[PDB]
Subunit: 123 residues, 2 copies
């Protein structure tokens, strides 16, 4: 059992870490056997390694990340809505997914699922 | 794989049917071998009859259901922020989950996992 407070605390640390470009910080919320599937329909990315590299390439550009609503948490899972904003060769993109976490006994995240399609990327 | 236009429409039908009390409305969107976890934590309800049972239980009082944001649709999946509101014995309640659908190739919803906690409910 995880406390909704704790699960919710992790989300922010994650959000803050994507904002801070803090790769060590984001990855250390993830179980050794954890997996990132982001966006959905990608083969899931299994293990600390692939997870680290996946967030490393997420950060090549500076990111602006914010929760657009209150985090939902019940049982061992977190869901939240958010925006990722960045600029590349003078063009701005705001991606707006819903992510989903599942936590294990030890407090860490064991799965991540970020759902978003073309209607969810904007300028 | 399914279309995000069809998936995004189906979330609008669902939500529309929960506002009009349309019980046949909401059920028809689901596969026969589908499951409803609402809230995440409880025992799944399985199959058209269990699914029906559940949604008639939800419509015991008039509901005000609305999408609070753009729907996310991809793969054969869709996620949607919403709020459910009702009044009982003077006591207004707002419930603000994040829902999730998974689909089959037939266009029908197989999984539904509504995910909300106590912090996502206000009553006064």
């Amino acid at each position: 059992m995880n406390t909704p407070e704790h699960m919710t605390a992790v989300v922010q640390r994650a959000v803050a870490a994507l904002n801070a470009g803090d790769l060590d910080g984001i990855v250390a919320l993830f179980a050794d056997d954890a997996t990132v599937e982001d966006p959905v329909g990608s083969e899931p990315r299994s293990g600390t390694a692939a997870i680290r590299e996946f967030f490393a390439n997420s950060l090549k550009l500076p990111l602006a990340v914010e929760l657009t609503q209150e985090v939902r948490a019940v049982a061992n899972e977190a869901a939240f809505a958010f925006t990722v904003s960045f600029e590349y060769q003078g063009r701005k993109t705001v991606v707006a997914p819903i992510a989903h976490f599942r936590f294990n006994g030890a407090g860490k995240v064991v799965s991540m699922r970020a759902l978003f399609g073309e209607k969810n990327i904007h300028a």
